[PDB]
Write an enzyme that holds these catalytic residues in place. Structure first.
Site, PDB file in Angstrom:
ATOM      1  N   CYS A 112       0.884  -1.083  -0.039  1.00 28.29           N
ATOM      2  CA  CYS A 112      -0.050   0.019   0.064  1.00 28.29           C
ATOM      3  C   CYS A 112       0.708   1.154  -0.050  1.00 28.29           C
ATOM      4  O   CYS A 112       0.398   2.153  -0.584  1.00 28.29           O
ATOM      5  CB  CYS A 112      -0.943  -0.029   1.223  1.00 28.29           C
ATOM      6  SG  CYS A 112      -0.421  -0.143   2.849  1.00 28.29           S
ATOM      7  N   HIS A 114      -3.632   0.785   7.192  1.00 32.08           N
ATOM      8  CA  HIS A 114      -3.743   0.888   5.971  1.00 32.08           C
ATOM      9  C   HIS A 114      -3.418   2.453   5.274  1.00 32.08           C
ATOM     10  O   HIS A 114      -4.111   3.201   5.790  1.00 32.08           O
ATOM     11  CB  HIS A 114      -5.160   0.313   5.369  1.00 32.08           C
ATOM     12  CG  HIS A 114      -5.305   0.160   3.983  1.00 32.08           C
ATOM     13  ND1 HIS A 114      -4.262  -0.057   3.048  1.00 32.08           N
ATOM     14  CD2 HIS A 114      -6.486   0.373   3.210  1.00 32.08           C
ATOM     15  CE1 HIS A 114      -4.711  -0.287   1.933  1.00 32.08           C
ATOM     16  NE2 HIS A 114      -5.842   0.120   1.707  1.00 32.08           N
ATOM     17  N   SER A 116      -4.523  -2.586  -1.844  1.00 32.25           N
ATOM     18  CA  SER A 116      -4.757  -3.157  -0.710  1.00 32.25           C
ATOM     19  C   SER A 116      -5.282  -4.520  -1.172  1.00 32.25           C
ATOM     20  O   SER A 116      -5.607  -5.040  -2.321  1.00 32.25           O
ATOM     21  CB  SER A 116      -6.193  -2.442   0.272  1.00 32.25           C
ATOM     22  OG  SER A 116      -7.299  -2.795  -0.386  1.00 32.25           O
TER      23      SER A 116
END
EC number: 3.4.17.17
Lengths: 247, 29
Positions: free
Chosen positions: A109, A144, A161
């Site tokens: 990510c 994330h 992701s």
């Protein structure tokens, strides 16, 4: 596991990658025995970096940027192939982005965020800013990061992701709050509770800038804020970014 | 000359993607 010394991967890191595989996969050494030295492996096309006509609307360009990011594939090997130092000046990070397009290896990510910046520096009317999400599931915390974007007053996101609903958003949300709440709802659908959001300032479009990305210009503790204060905090971040001009 | 570095990168990249497919297959099952 991070490859802390460029490409080709050195013998030590290469063996560590396979050693790590043998731990994880139930048939971990059967996997290596079948792949290592194999002469019949697929040729992997090097993805072509997208280039844009000036008549092409920016949202269509963003679709091509996200397509390119996906083509590299999410990195499930257990070994990160590029070292990202988040406080590196932008010009060093853009050198890294370019290296990522020339070597064409799987990424995660944070690499996708850097790549997203590199591939949209040609779009000065596009605002780019990192968004990091801290969630909670089964007694553990998870982080994330995506690249938030704003075009013509609408908010979207680019990134990478494991989950499809935790990366690409076409720039269609009218407010930053609506974008972030869309992520929070997507997390809730896979039983993750959103705990914190950290939003960066907009990133310069100059790939030779010496400035650092400011990842944590707004840090929001979701449940300590409550919904109204949460929205107002996001509106404020949106205004702060509007007033930091950079290209 | 430097074509050994390139073949090294090519061989490694092909195994990296073969591994990534297997690991991707596993991490959904």
């Amino acid at each position: 596991f991070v490859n802390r010394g460029g490409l080709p991967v050195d013998s030590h890191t290469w063996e560590r990658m396979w050693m790590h595989v043998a731990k994880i996969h139930p048939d971990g050494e059967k996997v290596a025995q079948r792949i290592r030295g194999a002469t019949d492996l697929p040729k992997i096309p090097i993805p072509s970096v997208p280039t844009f006509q000036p008549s092409t609307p920016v949202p269509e360009r963003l679709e091509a940027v996200q397509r390119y990011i996906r083509e590299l594939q999410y990195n499930h090997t257990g070994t990160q192939f590029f070292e990202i130092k988040k406080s590196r000046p932008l010009t060093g990070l853009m050198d890294l982005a370019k290296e990522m397009t020339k070597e064409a290896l799987p990424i995660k990510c944070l690499e996708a965020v850097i790549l997203g910046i590199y591939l949209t520096n040609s779009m000065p009317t596009l605002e780019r800013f990192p968004i990091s999400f801290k969630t909670y599931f089964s007694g553990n915390y998870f982080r994330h990061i995506v690249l938030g974007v704003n075009f013509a007053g609408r908010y979207g996101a680019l990134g990478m992701s494991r989950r499809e609903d935790l990366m690409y958003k076409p720039p269609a949300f009218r407010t930053l709050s609506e974008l972030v709440l869309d992520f929070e709802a997507a997390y809730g659908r896979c039983w993750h509770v959103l705990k914190k959001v950290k939003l960066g300032q907009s990133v310069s479009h100059d790939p030779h800038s010496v400035e650092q990305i400011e990842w944590k210009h707004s840090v929001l503790d979701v449940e300590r804020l409550g919904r109204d204060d949460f929205r107002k905090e996001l509106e404020r971040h949106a205004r702060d970014m509007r007033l930091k001009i950079g290209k | 000359q430097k074509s050994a570095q390139q073949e090294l990168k090519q061989r490694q990249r092909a195994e990296i993607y073969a591994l990534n497919r297997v690991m991707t297959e596993l991490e959904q099952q």
